[PDB]
Amino acid sequence: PVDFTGYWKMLVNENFEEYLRALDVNVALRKIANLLKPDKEIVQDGDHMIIRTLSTFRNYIMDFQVGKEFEEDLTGIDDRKCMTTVSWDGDKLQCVQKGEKEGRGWTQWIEGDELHLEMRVEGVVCKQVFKKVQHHHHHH
Ligand SMILES: CC1=C(/C=C/C(C)=C/C=C/C(C)=C/CN)C(C)(C)CCC1
């Protein structure tokens, strides 16, 4: 069965600038963010999912139950609040983020040693791929 648990290092990050612009992330933060190559530390614990998006400058932490709508605090990205639901779709994890922006959400899946993440908002698509890695680093 699909299990996202692991430590994952960014390999590619496609169209991130336009995704951030569509979120109205401020220009100075977009400049910082485009230099970053975040890791993902994921623990899948039953249907309790923790996805830590870790970078040298700032983190974004998700901690939620699959299937259950929750208030998602996007402080550090666009500082918005969404009413967010993450659901299994076969071997894919689907996320809908209800809020100010239309069409906001993402899909996550695994191909071999790769974690694939398609992020969407306002018809814009950013695609990230990470490689599963084994050398760990301490974090908060
Ligand atoms: C814009 C910005 C950032 C953007 C983070 C983003 C979009 C995280 C998306 C997380 C998702 C869908 C995770 C599901 N694997 C960092 C990495 C927190 C650094 C500070 C500035």
Curated annotation (Swiss-Prot):
Tissue expression as described in the entry: Detected in nearly all the tissues with higher expression in adult ovary, pancreas, pituitary gland and adrenal gland, and fetal liver.
Subcellular location per the Swiss-Prot or TrEMBL entry: Cytoplasm; Lipid droplet
Sequence positions that bind all-trans-retinol: 40, 62, 108
InterPro entries: Calycin, CRBP1, Fatty_acid-bd, ILBP, Lipocln_cytosolic_FA-bd_dom
Key word Cytoplasm present: yes
The protein's name in its UniProt record: Retinol-binding protein 1
Domain description: Forms a beta-barrel structure that accommodates hydrophobic ligands in its interior.
Family in the record: Belongs to the calycin superfamily. Fatty-acid binding protein (FABP) family.
Alphabetical keyword list: Cytoplasm, Lipid droplet, Methylation, Retinol-binding, Transport, Vitamin A
Listed result of changing residue 31 to A: No effect on retinol binding. Abolishes interaction with STA6 and the ability to enhance STA6-mediated vitamin A uptake
Function statement: Cytoplasmic retinol-binding protein. Accepts retinol from the transport protein STRA6, and thereby contributes to retinol uptake, storage and retinoid homeostasis.
Impact after mutating residue 108 to L: Strongly decreased affinity for retinol. Further decrease in for retinol
Subunit structure and binding partners: Interacts (only as retinol-free apoprotein) with STRA6.
Stored Gene3D superfamilies: 2.40.128.20
Recorded GO MF terms: all-trans-retinol binding; fatty acid binding; retinal binding; retinoid binding
One GO term describing the cellular component: nucleoplasm
Species for this entry: Homo sapiens
Biological-process GO terms, alphabetical: fatty acid transport; lipid homeostasis; retinoic acid biosynthetic process; vitamin A metabolic process
Region (Important for interaction with STRA6): 21-31
